[PDB]
């Protein structure tokens, strides 16, 4: 009775995500990188594969019902920390290009001035 | 695509968060077949976690997360030479 909605509901979410997994691991961790050239295009693919797996191993560990969840939780803020870094790096790439194009527009106006 | 499939991951993350929130042992008492269905729904998890085991192919698990994050690090250091030298 009480378990009867949630267990079929969550399994349907597994059923929902189950084709998404197979399209995610369609081509290999080498292949899906080796088809790509930009390391920025290589970047989050490493993360996102780990990003799901982190939640995946946090999910299945609940099914054993083990009272500990720390040594995957200890891995959790790690994966955040590396996701924290290159975004702030990629923020700085903007300011490299954001202001250099204003340098482009300014010096043309100087001869115009 | 990140924003699509992770939104579906988030969808199942919350559903994974929705899983053992209820008291689960009570119908494991009331039948094995609740537990066995919960075992069978874990057999999805025995398959769906294995998909990325297949991508490679607990103490097993403690190994490769290094080797996952191994390859994260050599990006930014190359990105350091790709950008800070640039």
């Amino acid at each position: 009775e009480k378990i009867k909605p949630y267990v079929r509901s969550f399994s349907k979410a597994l059923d929902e995500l189950k084709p998404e997994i197979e399209k995610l691991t369609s081509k290999s961790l080498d292949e899906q990188l080796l088809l790509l050239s930009d390391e920025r295009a290589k970047l989050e693919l490493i993360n996102r594969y780990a990003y799901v797996l982190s939640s995946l191993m946090f999910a299945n560990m609940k099914v054993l019902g083990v009272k500990d969840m720390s040594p995957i939780l200890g891995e959790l803020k790690r994966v955040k920390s590396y996701m924290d870094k290159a975004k702030q790096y990629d923020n700085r790439i903007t300011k490299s290009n954001e202001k250099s194009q204003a340098e482009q527009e300014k010096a043309k106006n100087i001869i115009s001035n | 695509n990140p924003d699509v499939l992770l939104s579906r991951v988030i969808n199942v993350v919350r559903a994974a968060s929705s899983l053992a929130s209820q008291d689960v042992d009570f119908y494991k008492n009331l039948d094995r077949g609740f537990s066995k269905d919960l075992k069978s729904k874990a057999d999805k998890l025995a398959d769906m976690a294995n998909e990325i085991i297949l991508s490679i192919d607990w103490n097993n698990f403690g190994n490769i997360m290094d080797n996952l994050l191994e390859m994260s690090d050599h990006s930014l250091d190359k990105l350091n030479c790709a950008i800070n030298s640039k």
């Binding site: 939640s55 955040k80 | 992770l6 919350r14 968060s17």
Partner: peptide
């Protein structure tokens, strides 16, 4: 709405 906060919420519990 940082994308690790879904690890942090307490679920809907009966």
């Amino acid at each position: 709405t940082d994308l690790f906060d879904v690890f942090e919420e307490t679920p809907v519990e009966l």
